[PDB]
Amino acid sequence: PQITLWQRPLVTIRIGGQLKEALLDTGADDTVLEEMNLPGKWKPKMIGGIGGFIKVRQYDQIPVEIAGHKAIGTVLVGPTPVNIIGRNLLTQIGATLNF
Amino acid sequence: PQITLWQRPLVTIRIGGQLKEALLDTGADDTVLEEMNLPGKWKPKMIGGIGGFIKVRQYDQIPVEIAGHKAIGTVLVGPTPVNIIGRNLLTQIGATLNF
């Protein structure tokens, strides 16, 4: 679909039996989710935002469904004010910025 | 244009006389530029995201020109590590997310 920016680009994601609300963020390199448990081993990592750095726990090749478009990839969880779908999973569903 | 997400969506804008490279971002509520000295009255404010809050000087009715589409709106000048174009202004050129 085409989404406009009068409102926040917020969409429903299925990340394995759970429905979540996340922002389609092209200003984000990665995908960071609010603290949840996702099956698998995790590596502790470090991303940064406008506020500075935060420690994350890194989960690899995890399937996410974004408004029925399928993606599979790195998905990070930590202390984010919202759930952001980064450019890493956006490219998999093929999203582009039009204007 | 039609911009892809394989690389950060960096574009040229012009502020004051400054010709700059800003990041297009659907995950930004506001536009944030790194320190620069624009003439004008301002108000401080705090903007946040991964890593917490940072203080910024808020300028009103500032003409900007994003890849040949001009706009006018609010602009936050603060110690941010990238120039960011938020939906405040994306909405004015007619940027859309499409997948």
Binding site: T26, A28, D29, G86 | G49
Partner: peptide
């Protein structure tokens, strides 16, 4: 990485 504004 960098991950972006509220």
């Amino acid at each position: 990485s960098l991950n972006x504004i509220x």
